[PDB]
Structure 1
Amino acid sequence: TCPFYKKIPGTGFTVDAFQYGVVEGCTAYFLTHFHSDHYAGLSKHFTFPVYCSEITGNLLKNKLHVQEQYIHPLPLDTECIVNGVKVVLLDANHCPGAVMILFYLPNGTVILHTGDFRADPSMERSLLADQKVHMLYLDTTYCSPEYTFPSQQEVIRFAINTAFEAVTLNPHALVVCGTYSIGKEKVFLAIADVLGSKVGMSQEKYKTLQCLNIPEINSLITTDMCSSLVHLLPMMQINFKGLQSHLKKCGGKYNQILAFRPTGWTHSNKFTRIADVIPQTKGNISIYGIPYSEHSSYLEMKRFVQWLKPQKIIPTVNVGTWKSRSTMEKYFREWKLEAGY
């Protein structure tokens, strides 16, 4: 049945709740972003109103064939009325089209639902600064102090410098990048930009990217693999056997692969600086795991919550075990005592 942390009190609304069938009493289904653990259940046969960003609505129509008459895209940073209730969509700094949702309840309660987000100080200057938030539905993916990672900018600098040096040393090396969903586009686009290449990919993945309003995308991506020296493959194929096989398909154009796997976190982070990252190598194939995150680190999350000062926090991630839930509640109390709210 639908969990309570997916339901907005005082309304008929749910958030990211498409896999429960007809949720009783639900008049509007919101979708924060196009990731499968959130959209699971949507299809051309869905006949209730879906509220989302423009980019998410393009993906619903083109990838899932949801019918246009049930897609209700909203502009960002704009007060809108849904079934009698004021709402605002804010940029979540997650994947393309991902939003946080502000709900202004008729009784005066204000609720923020972060969806999935990577907290940033730029959020402290959005419409959130203009009123108090009483209840926070919080993406707690990395809510423990061991989760540190570098800025996205530092990670992309490392990837660009590594790829440029490799291909300049060996003009017959191929660069491969893994993907399994939208997000993390800067990884492969930045590497293709420094090399003077388009990114080559499957027709299905090209279609997905063309839904994203990214400026000058026709100039950076292609379905012609022969003309590209940066290739995008499914994340599952980013291993030595999968890469050896890909190299066979390129017909002797290339004699070396440099591959990137942009994981979230991996325990090399508690010790290793970004400068100190090394690949796994076998023969003429090297694989780099780089810590490119589209979720808050522990400290980013803590800063956001201590700025916002909510009266009540409702975690939405890691809620399935008692030790995880109790641990998170202990951090929330610490943050509140330190900051004085």
Structure 2
Amino acid sequence: TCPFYKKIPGTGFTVDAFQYGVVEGCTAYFLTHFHSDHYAGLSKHFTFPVYCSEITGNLLKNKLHVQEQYIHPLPLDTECIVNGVKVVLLDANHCPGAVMILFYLPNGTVILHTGDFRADPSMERSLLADQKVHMLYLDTTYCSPEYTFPSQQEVIRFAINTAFEAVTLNPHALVVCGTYSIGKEKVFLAIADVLGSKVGMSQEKYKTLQCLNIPEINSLITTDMCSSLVHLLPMMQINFKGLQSHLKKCGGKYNQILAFRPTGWTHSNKFTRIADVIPQTKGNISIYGIPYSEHSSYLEMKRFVQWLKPQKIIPTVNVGTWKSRSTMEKYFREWKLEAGY
């Protein structure tokens, strides 16, 4: 049974609600992005209309085999009528193809559903500038002040400089980057660019990357592992045992691994600047945890909401405990009293 925070009142619509069977009264199912917690339930046997971005539509067809007749891609930044209701999709600054959805209800109410997002001041000059929002369905993943992390640009700067130093000191070092979903592609693409290499990966990951409309992608990635000095591996293999085993397979081409685990926030964020980050090392293997986030920091979230001034907020993350829900409601009230809406 579908929870209230995935239904859009006054419409036949749901958001990210594929794991509940046939939802009573749903005429169109929106999908914000291709992350498994959100698509959980879709497959080739699905027979209702799915509305999404072009990129999400490429992934549904090629990776999940949803039939073409049920995939409805919409352009971004464009007023569209769906089952008699005006909607707009906006870039969520999350993973490739991720959107926020603006719904203009027939009674005059305006609702924004952020999906998963990383708030940015650039959003203050989208189509959001032009009108009032009554209800905000908000990605509250990091809604507490202890959640700090650097910009994505500082993080990439750290990674490029680290990789370029190591491989210049030792031309026989291999760089490995972990992955388990779409998103965070800048980590491995930026490192391979500085090194003059394509990125090597499995056929399954190549296939996923080929759905993402990244410009000049054929110039950037490959399934030929031997030709590449930046490899991608599943996130679960990014440990001393998994990396040892990988280096064996490379046929004595390399004698050192430098590996990156992009994480979200970790408690080492509460003490250490990005500049000061050090790896875990065993022998000729070193592993860096780097805090590359595709969700809002607390401060970015607070800025966005204080600018938007919604009349009501409905959290979509951390909703399962009373302590979480109480904490989030307290911050929403501070923000509102501080800004005056």
Query: Under a length normalisation based on structure 1, what TM-score does the superposition of the two structures give?
Result: 1.00
Q: CA deviation at 1:239?
A: 0.3
The aligned counterpart of 2:140 is 140
How big is each residue's C-alpha offset from its partner over 1:246-279, in whole Å with a ceiling of 9 and x where there is no partner? 0000011000000000000011111111100000
The aligned counterpart of 2:242 is 242
Q: CA deviation at 1:71?
A: 0.3
The aligned counterpart of 1:278 is 278
The aligned counterpart of 1:291 is 291
Distance in 2 between residues matched to 1:270 and 1:313, nearest whole Å: 28
SS across alignment from 2:129: helix
How big is each residue's C-alpha offset from its partner over 1:84-138, in whole Å with a ceiling of 9 and x where there is no partner? 0000000000000000000000000000000000000000000000000000000
User: Matches of residues 147-296 of structure 1 in structure 2 within 5 Å?
Assistant: 147-296=147-296
SS across alignment from 1:86: strand
SS across alignment from 1:260: strand
How big is each residue's C-alpha offset from its partner over 1:148-184, in whole Å with a ceiling of 9 and x where there is no partner? 0000000000000000000000000000000000000
Distance in 2 between residues matched to 1:253 and 1:261, nearest whole Å: 23
Q: CA deviation at 1:62?
A: 0.3
SS across alignment from 1:165: helix
How big is each residue's C-alpha offset from its partner over 1:194-244, in whole Å with a ceiling of 9 and x where there is no partner? 000000000000000000000000000000000000000000000000000
How big is each residue's C-alpha offset from its partner over 1:58-90, in whole Å with a ceiling of 9 and x where there is no partner? 000000000000000000000000000000000
Distance in 1 between residues matched to 2:77 and 2:145, nearest whole Å: 32
Q: CA deviation at 1:320?
A: 0.2
Distance in 2 between residues matched to 1:234 and 1:40, nearest whole Å: 20
Distance in 2 between residues matched to 1:161 and 1:220, nearest whole Å: 19
Q: CA deviation at 1:42?
A: 0.5
Distance in 1 between residues matched to 2:300 and 2:270, nearest whole Å: 16
Distance in 2 between residues matched to 1:255 and 1:313, nearest whole Å: 53
List structure 1 runs of 4+ shifted beyond 3 angstroms: none
Distance in 2 between residues matched to 1:37 and 1:267, nearest whole Å: 24
The aligned counterpart of 1:305 is 305
Distance in 2 between residues matched to 1:330 and 1:265, nearest whole Å: 22
Distance in 2 between residues matched to 1:12 and 1:334, nearest whole Å: 34
Any stretches of 5+ residues in structure 2 without a counterpart? Answer: none
Distance in 2 between residues matched to 1:40 and 1:305, nearest whole Å: 28
Distance in 2 between residues matched to 1:244 and 1:166, nearest whole Å: 18
The aligned counterpart of 1:49 is 49
Distance in 2 between residues matched to 1:47 and 1:224, nearest whole Å: 38
Query: Under a length normalisation based on structure 2, what TM-score does the superposition of the two structures give?
Result: 1.00
Distance in 1 between residues matched to 2:326 and 2:95, nearest whole Å: 29
Distance in 2 between residues matched to 1:43 and 1:201, nearest whole Å: 25
How big is each residue's C-alpha offset from its partner over 1:269-297, in whole Å with a ceiling of 9 and x where there is no partner? 11111100000000000000000000000
Number of residue pairs aligned between Structure 1 and Structure 2: 341
Distance in 2 between residues matched to 1:256 and 1:179, nearest whole Å: 20
The aligned counterpart of 1:82 is 82
Distance in 1 between residues matched to 2:311 and 2:220, nearest whole Å: 45
SS across alignment from 1:269: helix
Distance in 2 between residues matched to 1:258 and 1:338, nearest whole Å: 46
Q: CA deviation at 1:298?
A: 0.2
The aligned counterpart of 1:5 is 5
Distance in 2 between residues matched to 1:229 and 1:3, nearest whole Å: 46
Distance in 2 between residues matched to 1:130 and 1:201, nearest whole Å: 44
Distance in 2 between residues matched to 1:266 and 1:291, nearest whole Å: 7
SS across alignment from 2:252: coil
The alignment-based identity, stated in percent, is 100
SS across alignment from 1:38: helix
Distance in 2 between residues matched to 1:294 and 1:43, nearest whole Å: 26
Instruction: Please provide the CA RMSD for this pair.
Output: 0.3
Distance in 1 between residues matched to 2:23 and 2:139, nearest whole Å: 22
Q: CA deviation at 1:310?
A: 0.1
SS across alignment from 1:159: helix
Distance in 2 between residues matched to 1:226 and 1:20, nearest whole Å: 45
Distance in 2 between residues matched to 1:36 and 1:131, nearest whole Å: 33
SS across alignment from 1:24: coil
Distance in 1 between residues matched to 2:277 and 2:307, nearest whole Å: 33
Q: CA deviation at 1:334?
A: 0.3
